[PDB]
């Protein structure tokens, strides 16, 4: 045959993220001693658009814990995070929007964003716009809170894990129809060479497992096995069910 496009994206050549104009990683502050035994006040300096990203990123400027210099630092913004706002990261941070305080100290039922799964990893869950995760339980005896991932998905993480308070900003992007082929041209301009998506049945038999034939049709089930070798694992992958739900 010939290499499938799903496999070629793994070369990550043409298919790499753009990101020249990206501001850098949008993370939480390094889990300092100050985070673990107090709090760091950083004022939000400016809320930026990172191209290719939905959520605005904030520019909180924490003062450096150990030296005379000030440490501007960039994290995806919770909604209502205005410039000049004083963020408070740390274990005994007050419970407010934008504050980053230990997950086990956040009240059960309150919704948090930019949650970190592993302790100290600097915020990986609930980072996309509009996204958040409600804390659904604490377990102080074993120090592991549960939380509901932005997908209907429960997950247990240590309470020492940081989280930010509130919904991530920029929510509701997806609600607006794109309408133009050109409009989606630009949302992916800042993302990657993801787009346009040619259908595999429109492709040739060399190009794709679905490709080829006179009427353009898949010839075999589109629901591929989990163990299917790459270049084969196209169509619906390890699908448990198909059909509209």
Partner 1 sequence: RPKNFGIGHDVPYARDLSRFMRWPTFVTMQRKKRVLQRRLKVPPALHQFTKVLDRSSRNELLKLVKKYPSETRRARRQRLFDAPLSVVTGLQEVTRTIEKKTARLVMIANNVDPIELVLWMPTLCRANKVPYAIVKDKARLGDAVGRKTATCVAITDVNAEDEAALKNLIRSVNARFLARSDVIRRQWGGLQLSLRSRAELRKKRARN
Partner RNA sequence: ACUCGGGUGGAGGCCUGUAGCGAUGCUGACGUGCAAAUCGCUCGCAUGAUUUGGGUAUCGGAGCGAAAGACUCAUCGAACCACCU
Partner RNA sequence: UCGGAUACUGAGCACAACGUUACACCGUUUUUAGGAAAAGGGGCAACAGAGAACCUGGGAUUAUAUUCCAAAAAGAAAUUGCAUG
Partner RNA sequence: GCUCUGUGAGGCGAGCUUCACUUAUCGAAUGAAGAGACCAAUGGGUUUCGCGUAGUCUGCGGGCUAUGCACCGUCUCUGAACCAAC
Partner RNA sequence: UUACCGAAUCUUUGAACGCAAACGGCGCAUGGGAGAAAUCCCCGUGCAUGCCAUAUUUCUCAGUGUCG
Q: State the DSSP code for 229.
A: P
Map the footprint of partner 1 across residues 80-99, applying CB under 8 A.
Answer: 90
Contact 235, 209 (CB under 8 A): yes
Between the alpha carbon of residue 216 and those of residues 33, 194, 205, the distances in Å are 61, 23, 11
Binding region for partner 1 (CB under 8 A) out of 34-42, 106-114, 154-162, 163-171: 34-42
**Cα angle 126-129-134, degrees, rounded to a multiple of 5:** 40
Which of the listed partners (Mg ion, RNA, partner 1, none) does 20 bind, with a CB threshold of 5 to 8 Å by partner kind?
RNA
CA separation for the pair 155, 153 (Å, rounded): 7
Residue 113's nearest CA partner among 29, 124, 105 is 124
Site string for RNA, 169-188 (x = CB under 7 A): ----------xxxxx-xx--
On whether 232 is known to bind a ligand per the annotation, the reply is no
Q: Is 244 in the site for Mg ion (CB under 5 A)?
A: no
Q: Dihedrals φ, ψ of 179, to 5°? A: 70, -60
Cβ-Cβ contacts under 8 Å for 143 (sequence gap 6 or more): 104, 158, 159, 160
- CB of residue 229 vs partner 1: minimum separation in angstroms? 41
Which residue, 123, 121, 157, 124, is CA-closest to 139?
Answer: 157
Please report whether residue 105 would count as binding partner 1 according to CB under 8 A.
Answer: no
- Is residue 95 involved in binding RNA (CB under 7 A)? no
Q: What's the distance, CA 180 to chain centroid?
A: 26
Q: Which residue numbers in the chain precede an interruption (C–N > 2.5 Å)?
A: none
Return the one option of partner 1, RNA, Mg ion, none that residue 217 interacts with (CB less than 5 to 8 A, by type): Mg ion
Instruction: In angstroms, give the least distance from the CB of 240 to RNA.
Output: 26
217 touches Mg ion (CB under 5 A): yes
Distances (CA, A) of 39 to 11, 31, 83, 116, 166: 43, 11, 19, 17, 18
44 binds RNA (CB under 7 A): yes
Quick one: 204 or 225, whose CB is closer to RNA? Answer: 204
Options 28-36, 125-133, 165-173, 233-241: segment touching RNA (CB under 7 A): 28-36
Residues that bind RNA (CB under 7 A): 1-3, 5, 7-8, 11, 13-16, 20, 27, 30-34, 36-37, 43-45, 63-68, 70, 82-86, 118, 120-122, 179-183, 185-186, 193, 196, 198, 202-208
Per CB under 8 A, residues contacting partner 1 are 33-34, 37-41, 63-68, 90
Please report, in range form, the residues annotated as the binding site.
Answer: 216
């Amino acid at each position: 045959g010939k290499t499938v496009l799903t496999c070629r994206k793994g070369n990550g050549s043409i298919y790499q993220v753009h990101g020249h104009k990206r501001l850098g990683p949008a993370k939480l502050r390094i889990l300092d001693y100050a985070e673990r035994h107090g709090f760091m006040r950083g004022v939000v300096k400016t809320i930026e658009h990172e191209p290719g990203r939905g959520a605005p990123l904030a520019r909180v400027e924490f003062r450096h814990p150990y030296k005379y210099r000030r440490v501007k630092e960039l994290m995806v913004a919770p909604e209502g995070m205005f410039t000049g706002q004083s963020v408070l990261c740390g274990v005994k941070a007050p419970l407010a929007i934008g504050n980053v305080l230990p997950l086990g100290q956040i009240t059960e039922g309150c919704i948090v964003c930019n949650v970190e799964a592993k302790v100290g990893d600097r915020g990986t869950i609930a980072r996309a716009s509009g996204d958040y995760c409600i804390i659904i339980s604490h377990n102080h005896e074993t120090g592991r809170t549960r939380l509901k991932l932005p997908s209907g998905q429960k997950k247990t993480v240590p309470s020492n894990c940081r989280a930010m308070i509130g919904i991530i900003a920029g929510g509701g992007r997806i609600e607006k129809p794109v309408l133009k082929a050109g409009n989606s041209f630009y949302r992916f301009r800042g993302k990657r060479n993801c787009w346009p998506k040619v259908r595999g049945v429109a492709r040739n038999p060399v190009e794709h497992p679905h490709g080829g034939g006179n009427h353009q049709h898949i010839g075999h089930p589109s629901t591929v096995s989990r163990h299917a070798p790459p270049g084969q694992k196209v169509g619906l992958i390890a699908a448990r069910r198909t059909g509209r739900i």
